[PDB]
Design an enzyme around this catalytic site. Sequence first.
Site, PDB file in Angstrom:
ATOM      1  N   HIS A  40       0.811  -1.190   0.000  1.00  0.00           N
ATOM      2  CA  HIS A  40       0.000   0.000   0.000  1.00  0.00           C
ATOM      3  C   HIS A  40       0.866   1.271   0.000  1.00  0.00           C
ATOM      4  O   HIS A  40       0.343   2.341  -0.266  1.00  0.00           O
ATOM      5  CB  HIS A  40      -1.053  -0.040   1.116  1.00  0.00           C
ATOM      6  CG  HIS A  40      -0.585   0.430   2.445  1.00  0.00           C
ATOM      7  ND1 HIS A  40      -0.321  -0.427   3.492  1.00  0.00           N
ATOM      8  CD2 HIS A  40      -0.419   1.681   2.933  1.00  0.00           C
ATOM      9  CE1 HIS A  40       0.051   0.274   4.549  1.00  0.00           C
ATOM     10  NE2 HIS A  40      -0.016   1.561   4.239  1.00  0.00           N
ATOM     11  N   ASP A  84      -0.031  -7.570   1.797  1.00  0.00           N
ATOM     12  CA  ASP A  84       0.461  -6.174   1.786  1.00  0.00           C
ATOM     13  C   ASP A  84       1.976  -6.159   1.879  1.00  0.00           C
ATOM     14  O   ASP A  84       2.588  -5.887   2.948  1.00  0.00           O
ATOM     15  CB  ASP A  84      -0.182  -5.371   2.942  1.00  0.00           C
ATOM     16  CG  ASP A  84       0.089  -3.895   2.863  1.00  0.00           C
ATOM     17  OD1 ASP A  84       0.537  -3.432   1.777  1.00  0.00           O
ATOM     18  OD2 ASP A  84      -0.161  -3.178   3.874  1.00  0.00           O
ATOM     19  N   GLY A 175       2.446   6.855   8.695  1.00  0.00           N
ATOM     20  CA  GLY A 175       3.821   7.212   8.437  1.00  0.00           C
ATOM     21  C   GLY A 175       4.811   6.123   8.834  1.00  0.00           C
ATOM     22  O   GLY A 175       5.955   6.158   8.383  1.00  0.00           O
ATOM     23  N   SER A 177       3.955   2.882   8.257  1.00  0.00           N
ATOM     24  CA  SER A 177       3.613   1.704   7.416  1.00  0.00           C
ATOM     25  C   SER A 177       4.674   1.447   6.388  1.00  0.00           C
ATOM     26  O   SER A 177       5.375   2.346   5.932  1.00  0.00           O
ATOM     27  CB  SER A 177       2.220   1.812   6.804  1.00  0.00           C
ATOM     28  OG  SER A 177       1.234   1.595   7.849  1.00  0.00           O
ATOM     29  N   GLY A 178       4.863   0.166   6.107  1.00  0.00           N
ATOM     30  CA  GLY A 178       5.951  -0.350   5.292  1.00  0.00           C
ATOM     31  C   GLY A 178       7.181  -0.711   6.071  1.00  0.00           C
ATOM     32  O   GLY A 178       8.052  -1.417   5.573  1.00  0.00           O
TER      33      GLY A 178
HETATM   34  C1  LIG Z   1       0.675   2.640   8.409  1.00  0.00           C
HETATM   35  O1  LIG Z   1       0.951   3.793   8.125  1.00  0.00           O
HETATM   36  C2  LIG Z   1      -0.248   2.302   9.532  1.00  0.00           C
HETATM   37  C3  LIG Z   1      -0.253   1.034  10.110  1.00  0.00           C
HETATM   38  C4  LIG Z   1      -1.048   0.752  11.229  1.00  0.00           C
HETATM   39  C5  LIG Z   1      -1.869   1.770  11.761  1.00  0.00           C
HETATM   40  N1  LIG Z   1      -2.677   1.559  12.866  1.00  0.00           N
HETATM   41  C6  LIG Z   1      -2.405   0.866  13.943  1.00  0.00           C
HETATM   42  N2  LIG Z   1      -1.235   0.282  14.142  1.00  0.00           N
HETATM   43  N3  LIG Z   1      -3.356   0.684  14.860  1.00  0.00           N
HETATM   44  C7  LIG Z   1      -1.897   3.033  11.173  1.00  0.00           C
HETATM   45  C8  LIG Z   1      -1.083   3.291  10.075  1.00  0.00           C
END
Ligand SMILES: *C(=O)c1ccc(NC(=N)N)cc1
Length: 223
Positions: A40, A84, A175, A177-178
């Site tokens: 994503h 993902d 921010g 994520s990944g």
């Molecule tokens: C990625 O940007 C991302 C992953 C996971 C979350 N939420 C939680 N860990 N609850 C937000 C954003």
Amino acid sequence: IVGGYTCGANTVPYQVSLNSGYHFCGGSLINSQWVVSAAHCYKSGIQVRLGEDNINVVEGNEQFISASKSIVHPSYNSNTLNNDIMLIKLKSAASLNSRVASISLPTSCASAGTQCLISGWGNTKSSGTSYPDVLKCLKAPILSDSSCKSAYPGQITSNMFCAGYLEGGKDSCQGDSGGPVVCSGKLQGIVSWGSGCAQKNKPGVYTKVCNYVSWIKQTIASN
Ligand SMILES: *C(=O)c1ccc(NC(=N)N)cc1
Ligand SMILES: [Ca+2]
């Protein structure tokens, strides 16, 4: 990362920042020429930034290398976030050293209860917004599949695990994520999704990297 701590400069040497004029996602360096991130996070025009601590200051250990190719998993579903995961190839190999280092892929899947290290430059607030300039860290356990499914009914596939705290307060966030989830020195997870951040009964959900090692190795061997 909400409820974490400042890692310390270059203490997470496999952590990368994906930059398209600005930081937008994390990733993990898995060899001198390849990064694993979340599907994503895909976009065109990615520059991989290695050796970062403060993403807004050149501090002297950075390597900035543009991507030559990106490969989203064949079966990625952007609606469910199943599969993902994506690979990013660097145009030139990174120079590996004590501050820019690859993280090993897992030999075995990690079990609930194992402690992991989650890191990133994402939001540090559950309510509102504050983005850190320096890398943040969180130690968090993998949760049981049963707890994970009970938190997110109908949403958890065999390619996902939960980690964190059902009480909330400590989690990944936008921010992050990944980026990596590292357990016993192996990349076991990719920061993937969750409902809000650090909310009660809504832990983070992570791509289960051990399911993808064969795809990763085969893809690298031919690209
Ligand atoms: C990625 O940007 C991302 C992953 C996971 C979350 N939420 C939680 N860990 N609850 C937000 C954003
Ligand atoms: Ca920097």
